[PDB]
């Protein structure tokens, strides 16, 4: 199955979000990112994707499908809008091994903060 997420300069979370921010999905599915305004791509952080997953990054304000295959969680950024929190967080299977992991590592404390509020 596939699954549409739009990247905007203001959502529900306030201003430069993905929505939805948390991707349920299972390995063989893809995930559609659309940027509904413009100056907005998707990447991959480095240590936040599973053991095995190939890193990624598309080019700003192109429409990106990625296939998902190594079960985990995956934290993507939007590279110009990280540090304003513009991140989604996406859960391949279940019970991610490295969703811990994700929590704890170094990041922004807006991202820290969206982080939490996704997962909740
Ligand atoms: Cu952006």
Known sequence: ???????????????????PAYIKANPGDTVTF?????????????????????????????????????????????TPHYAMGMIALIAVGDSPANLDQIVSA?????VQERLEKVIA
């Open 106 to 110: 170094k990041k922004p404390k807006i």
């Open 1 to 19: 199955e596939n699954i549409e997420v739009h990247m905007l300069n203001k959502g529900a979370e306030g201003a430069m979000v993905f929505e």
């Open 34 to 78: 659309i940027p509904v305004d413009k100056g907005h791509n998707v990447e991959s952080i480095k240590d936040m994707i599973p053991e095995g997953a190939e890193k990624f990054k598309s080019k700003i304000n192109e429409n990106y499908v990625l296939t998902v295959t190594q079960p985990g969680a995956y934290l993507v950024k939007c």
